[model samples]
Target: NDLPSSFTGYFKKFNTGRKIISQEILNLIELRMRKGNIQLTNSAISDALKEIDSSVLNVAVTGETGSGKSSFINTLRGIGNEEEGAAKTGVTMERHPYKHPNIPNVVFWDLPGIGSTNFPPDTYLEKMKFYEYDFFIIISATRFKKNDIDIAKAISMMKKEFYFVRTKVDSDIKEKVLQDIRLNCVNTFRENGIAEPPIFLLSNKNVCHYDFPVLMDKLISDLPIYKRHNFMVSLPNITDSVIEKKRQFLKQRIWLEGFAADLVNIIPSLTFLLDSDLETLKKSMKFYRTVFGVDETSLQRLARDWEIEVDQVEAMIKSPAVFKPTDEETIQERLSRYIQEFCLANGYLLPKNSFLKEIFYLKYYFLDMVTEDAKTLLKEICLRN
Candidate 1:
C-alpha cells in the first residue's frame, strides 16, 4: 500500500509489453451504458462477457481416405490421437463431429474423404453440405493429386476458404523436403485456378515441427475478428509461442473484466447478481488455470501426454496459489494481497460502483499472477520435450 503510482504500472507490464488497456473493453460496455441514465442497472457488461462463448466456430477437415483426418483434428485441438473425444483414427471415409473436450461451442467436422470410392471429388460438397463450414483443411497422405486439387477448386468455386495440408510429414521429412512437397501442392492449386494457394506441411506426432504452428496461426487469423480469441484460448499449451498468444489475448480482456467487477453487484432489480463477487473471482481464476492446463486435473492430463511424472510438472510452476493444487475455496487466503492493494488504489470507479474498485482489480491482478506462472510451466513443458 505504501508503493507509488508509477512503479506498479511499469512493473505490471514488465514481463509483457504495452497494450491498449481499457479502450476496447470500455467502448464495448460504454455502448450499452450510454443508453441509460446514472442510476440504471447494467446487464451489458454481463452480456459482453457471456457473448464470447456464444458463437460456434465450425471447422471442416477433409482429404483423401486414410489421410490422417482423425489425428490432424486431434492435434489441432490439442488432444492426443487416442483421447476419449479424439476422432477415430484410421477409420475410412467416415464423417464424424469432433468437439474439443474443454472448449464450449466449437466443433470440428471430419468430412468423408474426397476420393472415397463412390464419393467422387465433383459431387463431394453437394453430398456432405460443405458450405456449412467456416473453412476447410484439405489434407493428403502421400502427395497432392487430382483428388486434393479437385476438392480445393470446388471449395474455392463455392466462395469458401481451404488450405492444402500435407499430413504425416514426420514420416517422410528430409532437408528441404516439405518445401518440395509445398511446391508441388502450390503449383497444382495454381494450375487448378486457385489464385493464391496456401499449403502447410504438418505432422500430428510433432506439433512444433513442419507447419503445425504456422497452420494454427493462419487458421486463427482467418477466423472472424470477434471469434479469434475464442479459437486461440482453446489451443493446447505445447509451445512457447502458443502460450504467449493466449496470454496477450487475456491481457486485452483484462480491462473489460476489471471495469465490470462492481457493475455486477450494483445493477439494481438484478437482485440475483448482488450476492457473489467472490464466486465470480473464483470462476475467473479457474478459467485461467484450466484454459492454461495448470490445475491438478489438467496438469495430470498434460503430464501423461508429455510422458512425465505429474509432480515433475508441478515442480515447474512457482507462483502462489498455483504452487500447489488449487480450487476456488483453497485459494481465497492467497487472494488478499492481490485483491486489497489493487482495489484500494483504484480511485476512478469508486463513485460508479460501491467500494470504488474491488472485484475488477482482483480479477485482473490474480489472472496476471497465475498466468505468469502458467507461462513458466508451459515453457518448461516445451523445454522437456
Candidate 2:
C-alpha cells in the first residue's frame, strides 16, 4: 500500500507476467520522454570494474634462520616440501619468486633471513625491494627475535603491513604453553610500539588446524579491495573462511552483472537473434561452479589428489548445476520456476517493476545453492581424513 498509486494503476493494466514486463519497457520510454535524452555506453557502465584473474599480488615472507619460512611458504601454497616447484627447505640466500599454480598472478617471495651479513636489518627493505610486495609475513618457530621486530617496524613505516606467524605448533603443547607463546609475541610487539599487533600461531604440518585459517582471513581483508579477489581465490580451498569469503566476494557482483544482462536484452544492436538472459545465466552458473571448485573437473582432481574414487567426489557434490542437465530447455524450465517462485514471494510487485531485479534475485538464489554445495563437499572430505 505504500507504493505509489500510479505504479499500482500501471501494473493493473497487465493481465500476465510477460505483459507486466511490457509495462517496464514503457517506463523506459517514459524515462526518455521526461529526460529528453540519455545514453549509457559500455565503458561508462563498466567503470572501475577489474578482472579478478588478471590482477597481481606479491606476498613477502621474511624471518631468521630455522624459523620455518620455507615450510610456511609450502603450506600456504598447499604443497609439500618435496613437491615440484616447492620452495627449498634450507636457508634462503636470496629472494625467490614462487608462482601460485592456480593463480599465476599471485607470487610468494621468500626472502633471506634478516640480520645476516648479506641482508642486514638496515638495508633489508632496499635490497629486497619491499615496495613491490602487497604485504609481509615474518615467521618464527619460537620467540619473536629483534630482527623480526625490526623488519615489522620497517614494513609499517613504509605504509605496508606485516603479520607475525609463530609456526611449529603441531608439536605437543599444553594450553598454557600456547598462551605463553602468543603472549610473548604480543608483549614484544607492544613494547616495540606495535599496538594491537596481528599475530597467528600455525603449523606447517596441518593448515586446517589452529590459527592458519584466521590468518588467511586477516590477510585477505587487509588487502586493497580490488586485490582481495586474486589473493582470496589463490588460497588453498581448505578452510570454511576461504569458502565463505569467496562466496561473499562473488555475491557482491550479482547486481552489476544482472544489470548488464538486462541491458543486453533491451539493446536492439546487442540482441541479434539471441536470448541474452539465458546466455548470461549459463555463463554465471559456470563461473560460480568453477570458482567454488564444485564443477566435475575440480571434483575429479580433488579425488585424485586425495586418493579417493571419482564416484565418491560426485556423491559429495550437492549442487544441482553439477548434476542437473543444463540444456537450453532445462535452463528455461529452471528460470521459469525461479521467476514464478520469486514473483509469488514478493507479491509480484518487485519483479513487475524491472527485469533487472528478477535477474539479480535469480543469480543470488543460484549462488547460495552452489556455495552450500561447496561447504558440504568440503565437510565430507575433511571428516574422512
Candidate 3:
C-alpha cells in the first residue's frame, strides 16, 4: 500500500477536525523533527553501530544566572549539593563541563547565563561559543523576559536546538503561571521568527515526579537514532514514559523488523534483515531493564530509594520473562510457550517462526512487565497522594 511513504503526510494533513494534533493548522512539530534530526546513513552498518557509543553528546545547560541553574546542574549530574567536586552553588558562574557520575560519555557544560549584564544577546552567544553544544537547556525560574526571547532568537539564528526549563518547580507549582510563561515565550519567539520551542518544568529536590521524565521525552523529541540511543541509555529510568521512549525508537524499526510469524522456524528468511533486528531487539530490551533499575545494581538503588524490600519489589512483577535467567535456549523456549499460549487464546498461529516477531513480542512483554513495576514503584515512592 506504500503506507511507509504515504501515511505520515496524510495523517499530518488531516488530523480529523481536531485541534490537539491539528493545532494552529500547521505542521510545526513535523517541521522541527524533520530539520533537527538529520537521519544520516552510515556507509557501514558496523561504522554506524560503533559510532553510537563513541559520539560525544554535549549539552549546554545555560540560562538566567541565579535561576537555580547550578542546582539544576548538580541535580542532573546525580551529585548532592554537599558533595565535593559538585558544581558549587553561589560560585561566580563560569564554565565547567558537568557530566553524569555514572555516564561519563554524555557531558553538560554550564554555560554563562544570558540574563546577565556582562553578556547581552549580541555577545552572549559568541562568548559561550554556541556552536560547540549539541543542544541548549535555558533554565528560567521566573516570569518570561525579553532576554529569554533574545537568547532564543540568537540560538535560532545559529540553527541549534534549545529547550526552556523552569527549575525548582516544587517551590512554585502554579500551572497557570507556567502556561503563561510558555505561551508568552512561544509567541515572543514566533515574532522573532523562531519555530518550535519546547518547555519542561523541573524540581531539583525530586527527579521522579512532575516533568522530569517528560523533559527527557521532549529532549529526545527530534533526535535521530544514532544520537538518541546514547541519550536514552543515559537517561535515568524515572517513569513509565521513559520505557515508552525506547519503545518509540523500536517501533520506528518495526517495519524493518520483518513480519508476522508462524508456529516454528520450519523455514528460512527471504530477507537478510533478521540479524540487525535481533541484535537491536536484545539491546533494546536490555536497556529497558537497565533504565528501569531492573538490573542487580540498579535494583538495589531503586529498592533503597523506594524503602521497599527487594522481595516485595520483585513480587510486584508478574511477567515470567523478566528478572529470570536469560540463557538463549531458556528465553527462546519461554517465548515460544508465551506465544503458544497467546495464540491458543487469540486463535492465531504461534509466532516462533520468525526471529523478528519473537523479539517484537519479547519487547512488548518486557515493557508491559517493567512499566507496571515502575509505575507501582513511582506511585509508592514519589507520588502517593
Candidate 4:
C-alpha cells in the first residue's frame, strides 16, 4: 500500500462539485485521529487538547560554575541575557525556574553546579530534587568534569536521563578542537565505566552553528508523545529545517481541528468565507502565528537580537493574521479574498466545499504562510552575512 487505497479510479471521480480530502492526506488524517482517540480514551477530547496545549515540561540545567548554563538557558529559550524574564547570567545558592516567555508551561530550572566543594554528586542530586525534572542537561564550557560524570550516574541510577552539552564552541576553536572536546568527554565517561553518552557540542552564542539542532531533535524524540508537539512548538525558530519540521508537524494536527469543527456542526455557509466557524479558525490562525514566532513580541525580540529594523522583519510576513486587524469584518474580508486567490491559483473560483475541506485548506494556508515568514526572518537574520 505504498500508494493510497484509491490509487486506481480516484481521479476518474474528479468531476467535483464538493470534494473530499485526497486519499493520501485522508490516510494520514485517519491515522492521526486513531492515535488521538487512544490518547483521549481516558478523558474528553477537550481535556486532551488542553493538555497538549499547555503541558508542563520541567528541564533541569546543571553544570560547573562559569560553564555557560545560564547563557544556554537564555539562548535555548531564544531570549537575550539582558531581556526581561531571562535567566540571570550569574547564579546564587538557589535554583530558579525560568518560564519560556512564549511557552510559559515549559520551565528551565537553573540548578547550582554540582562542583561545589562541599556538595557530593549524590547529595547534590537529592538536595536539588532532581526527581522533579523530566530530564537533566549537563553543560560544560570545555571538557566534561568528574562531577559531571558522577551526577550523570546518579541521574541514571534514578532511572532518568541526562545529556551532556559542551558549550562555547564559538571561541575560535578549530575542527580538531571540536574533535578533541568530544573525545575528552567520551574518554572521561567511558573511563568511569559508563556507556558512551549522548554528548552535543553547542555554541551558546550561535545556536544555529554546531550541534544545537541535533540536540533539539534528540530532546524532542526523548520527550513523551503528548509533550513532543508543545516542546517542538516552544523551540526557537533558529534554523529553516526546524521551521519546516514545525510546519509538517502542525499540518498533521489540522485534520484534528477540522474534524473537531465539523463535530460542532457550525453553520456551514455555501460562501465558505464567513460562516465556516470563524471562532475556531481564528484561534488556529493565532496559534500558528505564535508557533511560527511572527507575533509582535517575537518579531521585536528577533529584530533586537539581530540588530535589524523591526520593519525589516515584518516585511517578510504576508499572513493576514499578522497584517490585518482581528475584527470579524476584517477577518471575513481577508479570508474571502484569501480563499478566492487560493481557488484561482488552482484554476477555480469558488467550488462547492465541505466545511472539513475548508477548514483543512485554511489551516494549511495559515501554517504555510507563518512558517515561510519565520524562515524568511531567520534567513535574513542568520544567513544574510
lDDT of 3 at 38: 24
Write the number of the candidate with greater TM-score, choosing between 2 and 4.
4
Worst 10 residues of 1 by lDDT: 1-10
User: Which TM-score value belongs to model 2?
Assistant: 0.73
Candidate 1, lDDT over the whole model: 0.65
Candidate that would win on lDDT: 4
Better of 1 and 3 by TM-score: 1
Q: Which order, best to worst by lDDT?
A: 4, 2, 1, 3
- Model 4, 25-134: lDDT tens digits are 44454454556553332244345456567678999998877778888888778777887777886566878898887777789998887665468888888889888898
For candidate 4, the per-residue lDDT at 4 reads 20
lDDT (10s digit) by residue, model 1, range 353-372: 33324555555666666677
Compose the digit string of candidate 2's lDDT tens values, residues 258-343: 44344222211111223766676666777677667777777877788787787777666556443267555555566656666654
Model 2 clashes, total count: 0
- Residue 250 in candidate 2, Cα distance off native in Å: 0.2
Report model 1's TM-score to 2 decimal places: 0.76
- Judged by TM-score relative to the true structure, which candidate is superior, 1 or 2? 1
List runs of model 2 lying over 4 Å from the truth: 1-45, 51-54, 172-174, 187-196, 260-286, 305-308, 319-351, 357-366
